[PDB]
Design a protein around this ligand. Structure first.
Ligand SMILES: [Mg+2]
Ligand SMILES: [Zn+2]
Ligand SMILES: [Zn+2]
Lengths: 69, 1202, 98
DNA sequence: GTTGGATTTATATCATTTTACTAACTGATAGCGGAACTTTGGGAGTAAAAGAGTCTCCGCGAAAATGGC
DNA sequence: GCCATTTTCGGCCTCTGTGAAAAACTCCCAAAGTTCCGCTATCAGTTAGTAAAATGATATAAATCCAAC
C-alpha cells in the first residue's frame, strides 16, 4: 500500500476513501475503473487509488453530479 | 444520539419517575409454579412479562394484543427484554443516609454543615441527639444532647426546641441550611483568618458549597427516602439443572431491606416502645448500607456459604468489576485459538490457517456465497452442505479467504506488534503456521504457545487491517525505529556459515564471472563454499539525490558471498556482504535496504534472506557434540594454583595479619580472577585453529567449532554460557545476597557434584521468582502509563510556538554514550542551525532530520541544536505534528490523529521484563563545570568542577592529567519524594546564619530587596554554603538526591524534563534497551497538566486551587485579547497515578481505579463528561478520536461549532 | 477451538468463555491499546459492539453478511446499560444528554 | 378467355364442459362456564419456669490520603 | 508540621463445574385447584345443485380459383 499512501498522504484518509469506494461498488453496483483480475472490492479500490483515478475530491464531485442528476 | 454523560444526585422525585411501580414484599418466585408473585422482587406488573408477548394469566397470549394491559394480571404484553430496563422503588419508613456520602473521605455530610464524622455517626446509630430548631433558647444548631441531658432539656424548656435523632435529624439540619449566606460567611471569614489549617479547611468547604449551589443539587437529596430497585435480569434467579437454582446476592440484600422496612412499618403501626423502633431503624440503616456498599460501614454480611455478599459497589468496581472485565475487555465472536507452528514456506503477509477454523469462522460468508451462486436454495440448505463438508464448500472457502485479512494475536500483548493482519493460506492440520520473521514481534516461540484469530467483517475493518495492520507495513519498531523483522537463530547461522573464510579450500584462487558462476561452481562440487576467489561484481549505487551509478569491478571474496549477492537488491554496496555476517551485519543489511530502497524491496529482501539462511543452515550440517566443548588444559593448573594460594591465605589468617572481612574479600578476588583467566584461556583455545595453506606453511585460522560459531554468529549463545559450558561456573550467591567463598570449579561438560548443584539451585529459584514478580510489576506500570497518556493525540500540524529544547551529545565523563545524530534523528528544529563560527543558515527552521541531514550535521560538526518537543508544544488538546516529529514505525512525519500517548506508554513499558581527571583527547579546556573540547566544535569530555593543573583556554594533550531498574523507573514516573531530599536555594541572595534552636538548625537567606527568608535545616545536613556568599536560585544547599518537585519549582520545565528523561534513559541503556526520548517527553507533558493560581487577575479563578493548564491558557488568551489583566500560576508535577485520577472526565477516572471516590465527587459536584477521550469512547462503544475515527469526530466538532 | 456465533451470557449478554462451552476469545485491555496505537477505530468499534454485546447489532450484522453487505450499524453496548442501571440503583442520577 | 361449382375461409349461433356461488349433512374438537370436591395456604394459639452473641481468625506490604494534636 | 490509623493496589491467555448442621404441633376457615359435564363456536370433509362463463363444435354465408369446354 506504499503507492496508495504516496498518492494520498495520510493512511487514515486513504482507508476512508477506499472504504467508501468499496461500499459503492459492493452495494450501489458501480463498475470497477480498473481490470478486476478476480479481486475483492477492497483491493480493487486500493488499486484505483494507486493509479490516481479515485480520490476524496473525485468521489465528492461524482456524488455532487449524481445528486444534481 | 448523545454527546455527554451527566452525573448528579437522584432526588426522590426522579427515583419515583424512573420506577414503574413499588416493590412491597420480599417474595421472589412461587415454589410450585415458579411464577413471579405480586409486588415481589420479580413482579410481572412492575418489571414486565416473563415470556415474549404473553402474560402471567394467559388471557392475552399473542402478538395481536401488544400494548394492552390485562385486567386480571396487570401485566403489559410486550417483550421479556423490557425486564432488563424497568426499575422499581421502595418507600423507606424512615430516611437512611447514603453510605458513600458518609464514609468516602472526606465526608460530604460532615463537611457541608461543619461537624465531625464521629459526632454524625453517633447521631446515626441513635446514640445522641442534635438540635434542629433552637427557637428562643440558649441552645444552637448541632449541639449534642445526651439522652439524660435531653430529659433535663425537655424538663426546663419542653416544647420550645426540637432535638431529633437519627438520619431524620441529619435531613432537617441540611434542610435548615442556606447555602448562599453560608458561602458568603466563608468568603468574609477567609480574609480575616491567618492560620493555614483553618484557611485550607475553609476553602475546601467553600468549594463544596459552591459546587452545590452551581450544580443545582440540594443537600436534602444527600439522604435517601426512596430506594431504587434494579431490574430483575441484572440480578437473575434461574434454574441451573434439575431444580437447582442460581441467584444473585442482590436478591438477599433487597430481601433484608424490604423485610426490615416492613417490620419498621408494623412496629410504627403497633406503637412499639422507643427502644425497639430505634433498633429497627438502626438495622434498616445497616441493611441499606450493606446493599449499597458492603464491608464499608461495618462488618461484611456473609451468606450461607460463609462468604461476604457482593453489593452494587463491589460489582461496579474492581478488577473483576464491570468496567475492567466487561466494558474495556470483551469476549468476542468470530474468534479462534490454536497452537502455533513454523511455516518456512510462507511470506510476510501470509499465515497458515487450518481449514476447520476457516470453515467455522467464515460460516456466514460461505452461506452468502452459496446463496448467491445458487448451489443452496436457502440458509438451511447451506448449513446442510457446510455441515456435510461437501466438495464445493472448500472452493467457496478458498474464494472467501482469497483477499480477506485475519488478525493474529498473542497474550500478553505488550506492544502494538502483538496483533497483526495476515492473508490466510488454508492448511490441513489444527495448528496455525506462522512466518518466522514475525515471531520476534510476537515474542513467540514454538514450545506450546497459542494464538488467537480474529476475522474483521465490515469493509472499513478490512481496509484498516490491510493498510495499517499488515505485517508488511509493520517492520520498524515504534519504540526506536530499528527493524523488528531482523533474522535470528537458523537464518543467522546459515548466512554466517556461508560468509566465512577458509584457508586452502578446494577451488581457491579461481576467477569467476559473477554470482551465477559461483553458484554453478559450488553445485558442481568444484569450489568449496568457503573458497577465496576473485569475482566480477556489478554494483549500482543509489545516491541521496537519486543518481543510479552502475559499475563493475573484480573483488576478492568467497563463493558464499558471491551467491548471496544474487538476492541483494540493486542500490547497495558489496562491502555490506564482503564480510562474515553475524546478527548485527544482517541487521545493517536490512536497515540500509530500508533506508535506500523503501519497503517493498526490504520485505522481498527479508524473505529471500530468510530462505537462503534456512537452506544453507540445512546444508551446513551444524551439530553440537561432546567433543565440541574443549576444556583447556590450563584450567586444572589454575585451579591448583588458586587452591594453593587460598591455603596460603588460610594459614595467614591465624597470624592476625588480616581480618575476617579482608580474608573474605581476598579469597573472592582470587577466585574471581581465576575465573576470568580460565574464561580467557578457553576462548583463546576455542576460537583459533592451525591449518596448512597452499604453500605448505602453518597458518592461524578462525575456528569452525559448532559452539564458537553459535556464539560468534550471534544466533543464540554468548561468552558467559560458553564459560559455564567448558570453563568454570564461578562464584554464586547465597539466598541472602552473600557470595560463597568456595566457587564451583566444575563445568557442565564434566558435571557437578551434589553441593555444587544445590548452590546452583539457590540462584535458579531466585531467578524464577524474580521473573514472575517482574512480570506483575511491569504489567502494573504499563497500565498506569497507558491510563495517564491515553488522551494524547496529534490534533494539529503546527501549534505556532517558538519554544524548544536544546540538545547536545550525551557525555558522562571522557567518552560519548550517544551522539547528537541519534538524539536528533526525526525531530523538527526550533531555530535555524548556524554554521560554527559563521552566520550561514545551514539548516532552516521547521525541517525534519532524516539520515541525509544527519550526515550533514555530522560532517559540519555542530554541537548544540534547538529542536521542538512535545513538552514545549502549545496545543490546547494533544500535540501537533511538528512538535512530535517523525513516526518511528513509519519513517515519515507523524500523521494527524494517531494516539502517540498509547504508543509512548507501550514503548516504555514493554522492556520492563528485561530490566533488572585523566585526559584522553587532544584539544582545549574550558570552565563552565569543566569541559574539554576537541579541535572541532564537539565537546569530547565533560566533568564536574569541585570546590587544577591548567587554567581556562590552555591546550591539553593526551595523558595530561588535570585533577532494581524497574522500581527506579516507577519511582521516577510517580514523582516520589526521596527519603533524604537535597535542599535547594529557594531565592537568590546572601546566606546568613541564624539561631540553632532546640531540635534542628535554622538558616536565613537575604534577598536583593532586603527580605530575610527563614530556612528549616536538619542538624545532620552537611551544609555546602558559607555566610557572605551570594547563591543563585536552584543551587544545591545540601548534597543528596533531588526530588523532581523542587527542580520544577526552582529551575523550570526544561530542567525537570531533562532530569526525568536521562534518569529513565540511564536505566534503559544500562540494560541494552533503546527507547526514543519523545515517549518520555510525552509522559512528562501529561505529568505537568496542573497548575495552582496565585493571582486572581480579572479571571474567575480563586487563588489557592488546582486547575488544568489548558483551561488557564484559554482564559489568559481571552483576557489578554480583551486587554484585562491575565492570571498568574505555578505549574505542578503530579505522578502518573494522581494525574490519571485528576482527569476532567469521571468515566475514565472511574474505570482506572478508586471508583468510589471518583463517583462520589462527580455526583456531588455534578460533573459533565464530554466524551473527548479514547477510554470513554471505548466504554460507550463509539469511534475513538484517533486514527480512522479522527476526522469523523472533527466533523462532529464542526457540527457543534455551528 | 473456533466460533462464529454461539451461546451468550445471561447478564452481560457477551459470548461465553472456553472450548467446552463453545466460547469466544477475550479481547482484553491490551488488545484495545494495540488497536488504539494502530489507529483502527472501525475494527475496535466492531469488536466492542457487534461481536460482543450489541444485541440488535450482531443479528443485523449476521443478516447483512448473509445478504452480502459487509456494513454495520453499531448501537449501544449492553454492558454500559447495565452500568447505568447499577449506578442509578445507588441513588446517583447518571444520564445521556442530547 | 372464361365461369361456375366446389373447395376452401368468415362470421355467428348452439351445445358441452367447467367455474362461481349456494345449502345441507357429518364429525369432531376446542373453549368457556358452572357446580362440587379435595387440596393448599394463612392465622390464632399453646399458662412449672424457662429471664446478656458471636467467632473462627489472627502467615500482606508500600504508599498515600485522611483526621487529631 | 507531625503522628497514626484507614484505604487502595498488586500481568496476560487456557481449563474449571455446587450439592455436605441447625429440633413443634393443632384447630379452623377461606380460596385456589382439580375434574366433570354441558353448551357453543369453529373448522375439515363431502356431497349435491343452480346459474353463468368459457370453450369448442357446427352452421351459414361468401371469395375465389381452377379445370374443362
Ligand atoms: Mg514458549
Ligand atoms: Zn394477563
Ligand atoms: Zn507543537
Amino acid at each position: 500500500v506504499q503507492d496508495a499512501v504516496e498518492k494520498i498522504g495520510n493512511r487514515f484518509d486513504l482507508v476512508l476513501v477506499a472504504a467508501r469506494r468499496a461500499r459503492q461498488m459492493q452495494s450501489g453496483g458501480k463498475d470497477a475503473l480498473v481490470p478486476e483480475e478476480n479481486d475483492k472490492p477492497t483491493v480493487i479500490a486500493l488499486r484505483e487509488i494507486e493509479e490516481g483515478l479515485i480520490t476524496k475530491d473525485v468521489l465528492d464531485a461524482r456524488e455532487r453530479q449524481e445528486q444534481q442528476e | 444520539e448523545f454527546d455527554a454523560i451527566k452525573i448528579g444526585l437522584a432526588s426522590p422525585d426522579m427515583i419515583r419517575s424512573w420506577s414503574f411501580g413499588e416493590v412491597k414484599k420480599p417474595e421472589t418466585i412461587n415454589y410450585r409454579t415458579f411464577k413471579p408473585e405480586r409486588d415481589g422482587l420479580f413482579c410481572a406488573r412492575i418489571f414486565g412479562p416473563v415470556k415474549d408477548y404473553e402474560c402471567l394469566c394467559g388471557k392475552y397470549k399473542r402478538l395481536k394484543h401488544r400494548g394492552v394491559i390485562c385486567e386480571k394480571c396487570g401485566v403489559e404484553v410486550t417483550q421479556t427484554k423490557v425486564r432488563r430496563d424497568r426499575m422499581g422503588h421502595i418507600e423507606l419508613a424512615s430516611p437512611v443516609a447514603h453510605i458513600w456520602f458518609l464514609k468516602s473521605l472526606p465526608s460530604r455530610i460532615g463537611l457541608l454543615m461543619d461537624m465531625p464524622l464521629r459526632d454524625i455517626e453517633r447521631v446515626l446509630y441513635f446514640e445522641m441527639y442534635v438540635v434542629t430548631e433552637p427557637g428562643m433558647t440558649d441552645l444552637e444548631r448541632g449541639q449534642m444532647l445526651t439522652e439524660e441531658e435531653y430529659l433535663d432539656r425537655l424538663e426546663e424548656w419542653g416544647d420550645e426546641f426540637t432535638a431529633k435523632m437519627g438520619a431524620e435529624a441529619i435531613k432537617d439540619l441540611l434542610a435548615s441550611m442556606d447555602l448562599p449566606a453560608e458561602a458568603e460567611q466563608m468568603r468574609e471569614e477567609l480574609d480575616t483568618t491567618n492560620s493555614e489549617t483553618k484557611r485550607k479547611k475553609l476553602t475546601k468547604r467553600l468549594k463544596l458549597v459552591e459546587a452545590f449551589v452551581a450544580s443545582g443539587n440540594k443537600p436534602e437529596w444527600m439522604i435517601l427516602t426512596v430506594l431504587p430497585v434494579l431490574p430483575p435480569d441484572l440480578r437473575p434467579l434461574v434454574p441451573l439443572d434439575g431444580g437447582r437454582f442460581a441467584t444473585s446476592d442482590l436478591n438477599d440484600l433487597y430481601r433484608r431491606v424490604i423485610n426490615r422496612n416492613n417490620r419498621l412499618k408494623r412496629l410504627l403501626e403497633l406503637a412499639a416502645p422507643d427502644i425497639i423502633v430505634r433498633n429497627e431503624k438502626r438495622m434498616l440503616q445497616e441493611s441499606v448500607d450493606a446493599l449499597l456498599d458492603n464491608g464499608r460501614r461495618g462488618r461484611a454480611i456473609t451468606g450461607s456459604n460463609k462468604r461476604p455478599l457482593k453489593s452494587l459497589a463491589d460489582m461496579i468496581k474492581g478488577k473483576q468489576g464491570r468496567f475492567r472485565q466487561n466494558l474495556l475487555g470483551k469476549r468476542v465472536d468470530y474468534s479462534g485459538r490454536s497452537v502455533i507452528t513454523v511455516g518456512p514456506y510462507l511470506r510476510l503477509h501470509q499465515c497458515g490457517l487450518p481449514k476447520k477454523m476457516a470453515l467455522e469462522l467464515f460460516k456466514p460468508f460461505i452461506y452468502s456465497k452459496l446463496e448467491t451462486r445458487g448451489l443452496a436454495t436457502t440458509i438451511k440448505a447451506a448449513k446442510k452442505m457446510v455441515e456435510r463438508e461437501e466438495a464445493v464448500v472448500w472452493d467457496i472457502l478458498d474464494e472467501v479467504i482469497r483477499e480477506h485479512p485475519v488478525l493474529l494475536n498473542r497474550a500478553p500483548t505488550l506492544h502494538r506488534l502483538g496483533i497483526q493482519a495476515f492473508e490466510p493460506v488454508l492448511i490441513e492440520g489444527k495448528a496455525i503456521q506462522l512466518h518466522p520473521l514475525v515471531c520476534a514481534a510476537y515474542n513467540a516461540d514454538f514450545d506450546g504457545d497459542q494464538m488467537a484469530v480474529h476475522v474483521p467483517l465490515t469493509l472499513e475493518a478490512q481496509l484498516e487491517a490491510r493498510t495499517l495492520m499488515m505485517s508488511t507495513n509493520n517492520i520498524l519498531s515504534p519504540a526506536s525505529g530499528d527493524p523488528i523483522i531482523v533474522p535470528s537463530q537458523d537464518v543467522v547461522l546459515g548466512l554466517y556459515y556461508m560468509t566465512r573464510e577458509k584457508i586452502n579450500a578446494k577451488g581457491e584462487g579461481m576467477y569467476l564471472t559473477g554470482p551465477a558462476e559461483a553458484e554453478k561452481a559450488y553445485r558442481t562440487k568444484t569450489a568449496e563454499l568457503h573458497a577465496r576467489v576473485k569475482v566480477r561484481i556489478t554494483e549500482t549505487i543509489k545516491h541521496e539525490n537519486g543518481k543510479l551509478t552502475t559499475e563493475t569491478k573484480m573483488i576478492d571474496t568467497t563463493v558464499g558471498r558471491a551467491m548471496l549477492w544474487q538476492i541483494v537488491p540493486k542500490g547497495l554496496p558489496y562491502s555490506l556482504v564482503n564480510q562474515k555476517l553475524g546478527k548485527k551485519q544482517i541487521s545493517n543489511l536490512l536497515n540500509e535496504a530500508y533506508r535506500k530502497l523503501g519497503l517493498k524491496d526490504t520485505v522481498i529482501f527479508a524473505d529471500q534472506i530468510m530462505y537462503t539462511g534456512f537452506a544453507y543452515a540445512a546444508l551446513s550440517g551444524v551439530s553440537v557434540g561432546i567433543d565440541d566443548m574443549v576444556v583447556p588444559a590450563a584450567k586444572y593448573t589454575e585451579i591448583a594454583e588458586a587452591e594453593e594460594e587460598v591455603r596460603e591465605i588460610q594459614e595467614q589468617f591465624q597470624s592476625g595479619l588480616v581480618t575476617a572481612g579482608e580474608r573474605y574479600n581476598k579469597v573472592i578476588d582470587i577466585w574471581a580472577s581465576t575465573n576470568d583467566r580460565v574464561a580467557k584461556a578457553m576462548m583463546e583455545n576455542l576460537s583459533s585453529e592451525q591449518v596448512i595453506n597452499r604453500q605448505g606453511e602453518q597458518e592461524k585460522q578462525e575456528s569452525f567449532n559448532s559452539i564458537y560459531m553459535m556464539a560468534d554468529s550471534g544466533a543464540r549463545g554468548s561468552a558467559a554460557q560458553i564459560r559455564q559450558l567448558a570453563g568454570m561456573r564461578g562464584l554464586m550467591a547465597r539466598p541472602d545476597g552473600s557470595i560463597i567463598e568456595t566457587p564451583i570449579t566444575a563445568n557442565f561438560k564434566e558435571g557437578l557434584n551434589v553441593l555444587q548443584y544445590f548452590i546452583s539451585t539457590h540462584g535458579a529459584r531466585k531467578g524464577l521468582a524474580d521473573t514472575a514478580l517482574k512480570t506483575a510489576n511491569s504489567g502494573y506500570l504499563t497500565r498506569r502509563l497507558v491510563d495517564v497518556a491515553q488522551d494524547v493525540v496529534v490534533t494539529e500540524h503546527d501549534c505556532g510556538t517558538l519554544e524548544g529544547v536544546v540538545m547536545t551529545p550525551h557525555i558522562e565523563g571522557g567518552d560519548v554514550k550517544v551522539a547528537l545524530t541519534e538524539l536528533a534523528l526525526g525531530r523538527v528544529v526550533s531555530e535555524d542551525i548556524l554554521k560554527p563560527g559563521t552566520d550561514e543558515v545551514l539548516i532552516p527552521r521547521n525541517t525534519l532530520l532524516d539520515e541525509k541531514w544527519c550526515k550533514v550535521i555530522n560532517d559540519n560538526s555542530v554541537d548544540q541544536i534547538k529542536v521542538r518537543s512535545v513538552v514545549t508544544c502549545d496545543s490546547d488538546f494533544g500535540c501537533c505534528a511538528q512538535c512530535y516529529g517523525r513516526d518511528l514505525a513509519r519513517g515519515h512525519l507523524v500523521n494527524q490523529g494517531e494516539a502517540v500517548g498509547v504508543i509512548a506508554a507501550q514503548s516504555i513499558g514493554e522492556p520492563g521484563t528485561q530490566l533488572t581527571i585523566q585526559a584522553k583527547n587532544n584539544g582545549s579546556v574550558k570552565l563552565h563545570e569543566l569541559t574539554i573540547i576537541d579541535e572541532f566544535g564537539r565537546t569530547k569530555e565533560k566533568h564536574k568542577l569541585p570546590y587544577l593543573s591548567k587554567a581556562d583556554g590552555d591546550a591539553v594533550a593526551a595523558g595530561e592529567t588535570v585533577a532494581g531498574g524497574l522500581p527506579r523507573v516507577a519511582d521516577l514516573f510517580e514523582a516520589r519524594k526521596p527519603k533524604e531530599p537535597a535542599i535547594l536555594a529557594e531565592h537568590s541572595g546572601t546566606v546568613s546564619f541564624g539561631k540553632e534552636t532546640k531540635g534542628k538548625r535554622r538558616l536565613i537567606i537575604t534577598r536583593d530587596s532586603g527580605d530575610t527568608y527563614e530556612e528549616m535545616i536538619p542538624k545532620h545536613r552537611q551544609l555546602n554554603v558559607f555566610e557572605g556568599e551570594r547563591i543563585e536560585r536552584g543551587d544545591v544547599i545540601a548534597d543528596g538526591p533531588e526530588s523532581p518537585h523542587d527542580i520544577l519549582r526552582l529551575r523550570g520545565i526544561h530542567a525537570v524534563t531533562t532530569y526525568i528523561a536521562n534518569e529513565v534513559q540511564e536505566v534503559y541503556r544500562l540494560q541494552g534497551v533503546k527507547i526514543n526520548d519523545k515517549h518520555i517527553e510525552t509522559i512528562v507533558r501529561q505529568m505537568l497538566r496542573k497548575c495552582t493560581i496565585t493571582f486572581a487577575g480579572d479571571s474567575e479563578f480563586l487563588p489557592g486551587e488546582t486547575v488544568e493548564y489548558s483551561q488557564v491558557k484559554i482564559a489568559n488568551r481571552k483576557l489578554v485579547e480583551e486587554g484585562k489583566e491575565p492570571a498568574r500560576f505555578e505549574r505542578e508535577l503530579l505522578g502518573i497515578t494522581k494525574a490519571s485520577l485528576a482527569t476532567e472526565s469521571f468515566i475514565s477516572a472511574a474505570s482506572f481505579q478508586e471508583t468510589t471516590r471518583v463517583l462520589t465527587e462527580a455526583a456531588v459536584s455534578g460533573k459533565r463528561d464530554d466524551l473527548r477521550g479514547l477510554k470513554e469512547n471505548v466504554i460507550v462503544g463509539r469511534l475513538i478520536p484517533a486514527g480512522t475515527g479522527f476526522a469523523y469526530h472533527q466533523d462532529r466538532q464542526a457540527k457543534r461549532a455551528q | 477451538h473456533a466460533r462464529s456465533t454461539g451461546s451468550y451470557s445471561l447478564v452481560t449478554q457477551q459470548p461465553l468463555g472456553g472450548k467446552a462451552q463453545f466460547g469466544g476469545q477475550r479481547f482484553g485491555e491490551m488488545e484495545v491499546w494495540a488497536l488504539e496505537a494502530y489507529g483502527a477505530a472501525y475494527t475496535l468499534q466492531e469488536m466492542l459492539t457487534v461481536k460482543s454485546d450489541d444485541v440488535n447489532g450482531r443479528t443485523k450484522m449476521y443478516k447483512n453478511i448473509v445478504d452480502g453487505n459487509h456494513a454495520m450499524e453499531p448501537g449501544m453496548p449492553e454492558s454500559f446499560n447495565v452500568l447505568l442501571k447499577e449506578i442509578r440503583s445507588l441513588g446517583i442520577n447518571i444520564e445521556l444528554e442530547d
